[PDB]
Structures are given as structure tokens and as C-alpha cells.
Amino acid sequence: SGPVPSRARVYTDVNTHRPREYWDYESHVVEWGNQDDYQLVRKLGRGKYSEVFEAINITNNEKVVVKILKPVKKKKIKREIKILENLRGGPNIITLADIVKDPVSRTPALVFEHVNNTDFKQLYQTLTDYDIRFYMYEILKALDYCHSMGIMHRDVKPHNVMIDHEHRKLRLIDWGLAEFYHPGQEYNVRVASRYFKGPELLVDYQMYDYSLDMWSLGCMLASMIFRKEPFFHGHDNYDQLVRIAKVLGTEDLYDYIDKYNIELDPRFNDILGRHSRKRWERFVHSENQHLVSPEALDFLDKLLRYDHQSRLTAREAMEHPYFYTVVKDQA
Numbered sequence: 342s343g344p345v346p347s348r349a350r351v352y353t354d355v356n357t358h359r360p361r362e363y364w365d366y367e368s369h370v371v372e373w374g375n376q377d378d379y380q381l382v383r384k385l386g387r388g389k390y391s392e393v394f395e396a397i398n399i400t401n402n403e404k405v406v407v408k409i410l411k412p413v414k415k416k417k418i419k420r421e422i423k424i425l426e427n428l429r430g431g432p433n434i435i436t437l438a439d440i441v442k443d444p445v446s447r448t449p450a451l452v453f454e455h456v457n458n459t460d461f462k463q464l465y466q467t468l469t470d471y472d473i474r475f476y477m478y479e480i481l482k483a484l485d486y487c488h489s490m491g492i493m494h495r496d497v498k499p500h501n502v503m504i505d506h507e508h509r510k511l512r513l514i515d516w517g518l519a520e521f522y523h524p525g526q527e528y529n530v531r532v533a534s535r536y537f538k539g540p541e542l543l544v545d546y547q548m549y550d551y552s553l554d555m556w557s558l559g560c561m562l563a564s565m566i567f568r569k570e571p572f573f574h575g576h577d578n579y580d581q582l583v584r585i586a587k588v589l590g591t592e593d594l595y596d597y598i599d600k601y602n603i604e605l606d607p608r609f610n611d612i613l614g615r616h617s618r619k620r621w622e623r624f625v626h627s628e629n630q631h632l633v634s635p636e637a638l639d640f641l642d643k644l645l646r647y648d649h650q651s652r653l654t655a656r657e658a659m660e661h662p663y664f665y666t667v668v669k670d671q672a
């Protein structure tokens with residue numbers, strides 16, 4: 342027939358057991374606030390869907406991050422706002438503070454709790470192998486929470502992780518691509534950034550789930566323990582799958598197509614080729630070794646799998662030995 346269906350191993354029916362309004366973001370009404378309450382201070386950076394200002398709530402001299410949305414469809418704003426309000430208060434989840442309108446256009450603007458970013462690049466020549474485990478752990482907290490809240494982030498990557506190194510605080514931000522998981526629903530593959538897309542996005546398997554965030558967590562992991570950025574450095578969505586296959590090899594790629602009966606774009610049928618699965622040792626060198634460990638390589642292997650159902654879950658991730666040291670430390 343056609344593609345074999347899939348279901349999340351965990352948190353599957355979580356949404357079906359909440360009131361409709363929780364995930365039906367289409368029918369959610371926006372409680373707007375007064376942009377007059379904030380004065381833009383300075384610009385912090387650009388972005389695909391938003392320009393990001395530092396701002397002051399003149400109500401109370403509070404520091405704040407304003408993020409002027411770039412125009413999508415009203416149902417995408419409602420989606421982002423809904424999700425942020427559900428996750429609000431959760432571990433390492435960016436806190437949505439108010440919703441206003443850019444006064445000279447109308448483009449809505451989200452207002453967030455302020456988090457100092459420590460230089461996403463200057464924060465590299467100072468990460469010890471413990472730094473990585475710890476922050477990896479902080480991110481998994483955010484992932485188990487939103488999965489367990491029925492939400493896939495769908496855009497995990499270092500740019501969307503804010504770190505305050507001086508105080509070991511970390512916030513997973515920019516939820517504009519997230520979605521609610523529903524069993525049997527088919528999602529858009531054009532999501533997440535190219536270097537981080539899951540195999541299921543590239544082969545066009547639309548009935549994916551939380552475990553796509555887990556694949557991206559592995560692309561983050563690789564690039565950071567090996568100091569290779571990006572790890573899977575694809576020239577486009579097509580090549581990106583070739584770059585993965587060269588590491589994971591084509592045999593498991595074809596087992597994964599076979600078992601889900603995915604229809605491979607014939608474009609691939611010329612460029613994937615045949616490739617063995619290479620042992621992680623080949624990406625270890627003198628400049629990155631202090632961060633590689635059998636613990637760390639095992640854990641990476643158990644995330645970077647074609648078959649989305651066989652990747653570690655966020656919660657399974659947090660029980661791995663690569664975090665034993667961290668787990669005991671919190672206490």
C-alpha cells in the first residue's frame with residue numbers, strides 16, 4: 342500500500358486526556374497587553390521569524406526580552422503562544438511574560454523573561470567535558486517536560502538554547518516550530534534547521550513524534566564532543582541525508598525505509614550509494630579528546646538512529662551513565 346504508521350513510545354495519548362482547549366491552539370483567543378508598558382532598549386540579534394530586542398517594562402524597571410514576530414499566519418502565532426503558556430513554569434523553559442503589538446506596524450510581539458546569553462562562540466573554548474554533560478542534562482529536563490506535556494519542540498539546536506554560564510542557568514527558547522503530538526497525525530517535514538533534521542524529515546515520513554527532538558539532541562552532542570560544527574554538514578536537504586548515511590551507513594537507512602515502507606524520492610536513488618557504518622573513533626583527535634569518553638560515545642550512538650522509535654527517549658537519556666556524575670551532584 343503506502344507508509345506504515347507510527348506512534349510515540351512514550352507520552353502517546355497525553356493530549357487526548359486533556360481538555361480540547363489545551364491543544365486546539367486554533368480556537369485559542371489571544372489576551373493582548375499594552376506595548377506602552379515597554380520601551381525597547383537595544384537590539385540583541387536577528388532571526389528567521391523574529392528580531393530580538395532588549396527592553397524595559399517601565400511598570401517596574403524590569404529587564405525583559407521583546408521578540409517582534411515576523412508575519413506568519415495568525416494560527417502560527419496562536420500555536421507559539423499556546424505552547425509557551427502550557428510549558429510556562431517548566432524546567433529550563435523560556436518564560437512568556439506578556440503579548441503586545443509593535444506600535445508602528447501590528448506584527449505581534451512576544452515578551453519574555455530576560456536571560457543573559459553567554460557568547461555562543463566564546464562559550465566553546467571554556468566548555469569542559471563536565472560543562473557539556475551538565476548542560477546536556479539541563480536541556481533534557483526541558484525536553485522530558487515538554488514531551489511529557491504533549492509538545493515536540495522540532496527546532497532543537499545550539500542557537501535556540503540560551504545559557505547563562507556564570508549562574509549555570511539554561512533556557513530552551515524560540516518555540517515557534519513546536520507542535521502538539523497526536524497519534525496518527527502527519528506533520529510537515531519542512532521543520533527544524535537543515536544540519537539538525539531527522540532522517541524521517543529527509544525521507545519524508547510525516548508521522549513522527551518527540552523522538553525527532555532526540556535526533557537533534559544527538560547532532561548537538563556530536564558537534565560538541567568532537568568540536569565539529571555542524572556534525573552532519575549538508576549542502577541541502579538531499580545531501581544532508583547523504584552526509585548522515587556516510588556516518589551511519591546505508592544498510593540501516595535501507596532497513597528503515599523498508600520497515601516503514603517509505604517511498605524514497607527517486608532523486609536519492611542516485612546519490613545515497615553504499616556506505617559502511619563508521620565507528621565514532623574516526624572523529625576523535627587530539628583537539629577534542631578530553632571531551633570524548635566511552636560513556637559519551639555510547640550515549641551518542643543511542644540517539645543518532647534512523648529508526649525514530651529506537652532512539653533514546655529524553656527520560657531514558659537522563660538515566661544514561663554519561664550523566665551519573667551530574668545526577669549525584671544535584672543533591
Ligand SMILES: Fc1cc(F)c2[nH]ccc2c1
Nearest residue numbers: 376379381409441443450
Ligand atoms: F514590538 C514591540 C514591542 C514593544 F513592547 C514595544 N515598545 C515600544 C516599541 C515596541 C515594539
